């Protein structure tokens, strides 16, 4: 029973592998890029099954020209005892062999086998460093990604910094797009994993992210640069970038990525004085994970110092587990700024003594200093009057008849005309 | 069948400040208990209140005797004969709701009703189980069954006769309430039905009209609610029967805020003891406050806090705090000034609000179109 | 049925008087209009507030200085009422395209 | 023209919904495109002429 169903699943997975190989072969036909991402898109689906039988069948099936590069995976490859070339000795395309080696890499990655995984990944990316074909650039992106992933659970992410830097440059000269973006994101993750935020920031300023990058890669890059600018006091742009990242993240999957981005967005918005909307704290897939961040947010809204301290004491482990402890401390000292933002949002004119009384600041001069500091930033638009005690807010002129809507709607033109231009450029009529 | 909420919400689930834990309501529940003897309300009564008193089993003895006798009668009438469709089997399950629902539980009754539904053809049985278990899941906090049954009735069952489901919006009084559903829909079907009630099983007419008024004046603040809830005939008649509700409604409509707040406090308190208590009494009294504040702020450009306090009940400082809290929440467009003691309204004109809405909706559409464009053509 | 009708007639007459007065004025003390209409300041203020709220007379009431202001709302808005709706309309269109995207 | 374009957009949405449940087998789109083109040409010309007038005549 189980053996029969397992065999059918293995056969259908092998058929999908055959189809992917044929698609990669067709990609070089016509001398055009793409048609490889079609095979690479179902990569998680194929990766899910990856039985030993199907992997061995594929290895024996597409490698009629036996060389040593396969004679390394064979020692770890286990064949069925009692239990197909799709068919001459035509030499293998580099993309095809890279693909099959990549699924080997993924299987050995899944089964917690890491050291020989490091070896096979090393032998995989050693060869592709010699090629100069754009068809092998799309596959190279995933190759590097799972190479870094292999080195991650091997706890040697620091070693690969040189290799990723070299491949990133190589992609930069060859005007690579997918490989360049994947390498840049891997480099950013490497820098962050060892808290080298200054190095990551310096790298970001000197490297331009390709606009034609994939949605997932764009989201990852946005999250990484948002974390950079958030731990680098550029809170407003960090929040903007994090929201942009959440927009481009996959909707169905990517639970962990969305959880991390939501946690950081909560902390950044709280630091900015704004209040995150309660809606995100309610989705199932996000609720419990954000539960520690929820009890925190309430305190920020109330300014209850004791509640903040208790939440920190009972959830510091979780906060450090996702690396939000330091930002949370900065928030613990910016709760007052949040309160001042709320006060100035509600009131138009208000005496400083009222500020001190409402915020429990225990001093009118201290409230004066705090509101002056907050209004120095873009936190509050006001105009303090020390002669009397006002915190008079700026007059709200009619935004219409003010050239501001013209500017916004001009940006929206630029965007929509740009979208139309790319859409009409990417029509790609066929030859026959 | 089982009308008075079985007194169980007001029974010992309203302790502390509401304090309702023992009174004549316990007597009413116990008389509704002893007649058609039941042990199902005695689950929690076997745990916390009247846990192991003499009566707890002194009633259980002949209760079990009676329910065994009647279940035996039903089983004999079910096995001896082979009655089809709406039959003695449906009688067994309707009793089983008059029973084990009020002996131990709905689960057996839910199963039996499912079986007879597979056996029956006509539709009132399905509505019967809908309301049976809506009230049971108001006893035991069930909503998925209610919405499943409502979908079954409305989408599929309501292709023969009609005129029945409307009042089963009572769940919609408490489904999406604290944002959109304590009102809007819950009022547009209460209003659509107030003329033709014909559902006295769930609630008397007076209670239905009070619910209708309560949900309509939060659904509709002054968007010509008068065309349906003030010029309304039957609502006006029952309001002639109910002075408190009529005063509470017309005080808001006639801008008599000083008495409108006292009526709202009375509504809050009498609402804190209901099937409607636990869901949104806090929410309703916040929304009505915001509604009255926006009504007063409208038709004004700058109001002295003293004028508000004297004309809106009391509490210059109370009104200051409330306006601060409500502006901080983004509602109640107005800016409050300190010791100058002015409140300035900043409601944008039609053009500016139109521009802001254009920006918002266009940003939504542009993000959608950007995502769509980028996932296509890679 | 004669007290109710006469009270309604009195309110109608008060509204008609109040709109047939203040028409000259663009920003007038409520005290002056109370004097002109021979009614209490609080009574006429309440009636004015109710009339504004019912949108039976365009204007605003600045209680901070005890004044009543009169103006009109521009009807140029109509194009946005189309514009906005069209946006939501094509929102649906984009949604449909998403389904076709699921085809590809 | 914007009202006509709204009606055309409703028709376009209705027609596109049919596109899904229809294999390869007046267009509310072509009319939509024509209205869009006339709107953009008219308003672009009017804007540019207006501001050229603002800045060439003092």
């Amino acid at each position: 029973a189980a053996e029969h169903s397992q065999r059918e699943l293995d056969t259908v997975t092998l058929e999908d592998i055959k189809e992917h190989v044929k698609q990669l072969e067709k990609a070089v036909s016509g001398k055009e890029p793409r048609f490889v991402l079609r095979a690479l898109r179902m990569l998680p689906s194929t990766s899910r099954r990856l039985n030993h039988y199907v992997l061995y069948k594929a290895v024996q099936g597409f490698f009629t020209s036996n060389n040593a590069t396969r004679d390394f995976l064979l020692p770890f490859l286990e064949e069925p005892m009692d239990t197909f070339r799709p068919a001459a000795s035509t030499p293998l395309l580099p993309e095809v062999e890279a693909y099959l080696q990549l699924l080997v890499v993924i299987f050995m990655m899944n089964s917690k086998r890491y050291k020989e995984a490091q070896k096979i990944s090393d032998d995989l990316m050693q060869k592709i460093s010699t090629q100069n074909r754009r068809a092998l650039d799309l596959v190279a992106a995933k190759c590097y990604y799972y190479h870094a992933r292999v080195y991650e659970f091997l706890d040697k992410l620091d070693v690969v910094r040189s290799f990723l830097h070299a491949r990133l440059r190589t992609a930069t000269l060859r005007h690579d797009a997918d490989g360049q973006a994947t390498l840049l994101n891997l480099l950013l993750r490497n820098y962050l994993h060892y808290s080298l935020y200054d190095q990551a920031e310096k790298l970001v300023s000197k490297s331009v992210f390709p606009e034609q990058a994939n949605n997932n890669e764009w989201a990852r890059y946005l999250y990484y640069t948002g974390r950079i600018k958030a731990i680098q006091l550029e809170y407003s742009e960090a929040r903007r970038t994090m929201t942009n990242a959440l927009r481009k993240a996959p909707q169905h999957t990517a639970v962990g990525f969305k959880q991390t981005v939501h946690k950081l967005l909560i902390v950044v918005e709280l630091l900015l004085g704004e209040i995150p909307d309660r809606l995100q704290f309610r989705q199932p897939s996000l609720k419990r994970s954000l539960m520690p961040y929820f009890l925190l947010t309430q305190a920020v809204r109330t300014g209850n110092l004791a509640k903040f301290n208790q939440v920190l004491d009972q959830f510091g482990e979780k906060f450090q587990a996702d690396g939000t402890y330091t930002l949370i401390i900065r928030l613990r000292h910016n709760v007052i700024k949040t309160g001042v933002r709320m006060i100035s949002l509600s009131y138009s004119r208000i005496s400083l003594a009222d500020i001190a009384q409402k915020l429990q600041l225990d001093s009118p001069e201290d409230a004066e200093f705090i509101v002056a500091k907050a209004i120095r930033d873009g936190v509050i638009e006001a105009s303090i009057n020390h002669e009397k005690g006002y915190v008079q807010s700026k007059e709200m002129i009619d935004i219409y008849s003010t050239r501001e809507p013209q500017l916004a709607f001009h940006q929206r033109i630029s965007f929509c005309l740009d979208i139309h231009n790319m859409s009409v450029k990417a029509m790609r009529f066929p030859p026959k | 069948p089982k009308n008075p909420d079985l007194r169980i919400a007001q029974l010992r689930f309203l302790l502390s400040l509401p304090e309702h834990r023992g009174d004549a309501a316990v007597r009413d529940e116990l008389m509704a208990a002893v007649r058609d003897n039941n042990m199902a309300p005695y689950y929690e009564a076997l745990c916390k209140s009247l846990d192991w008193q003499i009566d707890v089993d002194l009633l259980n003895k002949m209760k079990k005797a009676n329910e065994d006798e009647l279940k035996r009668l039903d089983e004999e009438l079910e096995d001896a004969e082979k009655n089809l469709g709406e039959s003695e089997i449906r009688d067994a399950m309707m009793a089983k709701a008059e029973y084990l629902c009020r002996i131990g539980d709905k689960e057996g009754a839910l199963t039996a009703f499912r079986k007879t539904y597979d056996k029956t053809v006509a539709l009132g049985h399905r509505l019967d189980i809908v309301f049976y278990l809506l009230r049971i899941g108001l006893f035991y906090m069930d909503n998925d069954l209610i919405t499943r049954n409502t979908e079954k009735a409305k989408s599929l069952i309501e292709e023969g006769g009609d005129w029945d489901r409307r009042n089963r919006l009572k769940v919609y009084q408490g489904l999406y309430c604290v944002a959109i559903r304590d009102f809007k829909q819950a009022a547009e079907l209460f209003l659509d039905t107030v003329s033709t009630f014909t559902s006295y099983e769930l609630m008397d007419y007076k209670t239905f009209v009070t619910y209708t008024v309560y949900v309509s004046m939060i659904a509709l603040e002054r968007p010509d609610l008068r065309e349906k809830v003030i010029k309304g005939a039957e609502i006006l008649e029952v309001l002639h029967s109910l002075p408190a509700v009529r005063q509470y409604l017309f005080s808001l409509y006639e801008c008599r805020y000083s008495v409108f707040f006292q009526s709202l406090a009375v509504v809050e308190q009498e609402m804190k003891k209901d099937w409607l208590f636990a869901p949104h009494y806090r929410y309703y009294v916040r929304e009505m406050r915001i509604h009255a504040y926006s009504q007063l702020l409208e038709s004004y450009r700058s109001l002295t806090l003293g004028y508000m306090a004297e004309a809106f009940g009391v509490g210059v400082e109370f009104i200051d705090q409330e306006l601060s809290r409500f502006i901080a929440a983004g509602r109640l467009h107005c800016k409050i000034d300190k010791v100058n003691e002015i409140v300035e309204t900043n409601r944008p004109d039609s053009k500016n609000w139109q521009y802001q809405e254009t920006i918002k909706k266009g940003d939504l559409l542009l993000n959608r179109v950007q995502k769509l464009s980028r996932v296509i053509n890679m | 049925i004669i007290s109710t009708h006469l009270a309604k007639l009195y309110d109608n007459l008060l509204e008609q008087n109040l709109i047939r007065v203040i028409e000259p004025f663009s920003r007038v003390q409520i005290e002056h209009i109370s004097s002109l209409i021979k009614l209490s300041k609080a009574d006429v203020e309440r009636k004015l507030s109710q009339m504004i709220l019912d949108k039976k007379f365009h204007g605003i009431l600045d209680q901070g200085e005890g004044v009543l202001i009169i103006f009109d709302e521009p009807p140029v808005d109509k194009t946005y009422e189309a514009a906005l709706e069209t946006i939501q309309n094509m929102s649906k269109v984009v949604d449909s395209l998403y389904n076709k995207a699921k085809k590809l | 023209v914007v009202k006509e374009m709204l009606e055309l957009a409703k028709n376009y949405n209705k027609a596109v919904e049919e596109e899904d449940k229809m294999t390869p087998e007046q267009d509310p789109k072509r009319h939509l495109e024509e209205h869009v083109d006339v709107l953009m040409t008219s308003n672009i010309v009017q804007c540019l002429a207006a501001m050229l007038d603002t800045v060439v005549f003092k």
């Binding site: 929509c416 029509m427 790609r428 009529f429 | 769509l372 | 946006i87 | 374009m5 789109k29 495109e33 709107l39």
Partner: peptide, 30 residues
Amino acid sequence: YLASLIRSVVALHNLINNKIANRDAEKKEG
């Protein structure tokens, strides 16, 4: 805005039809 959005959405829809029709022809090539 309005006109551009409409024009952009129409162009995007025209791209969907092409990106579908092309893969239809390619799959037929089967």
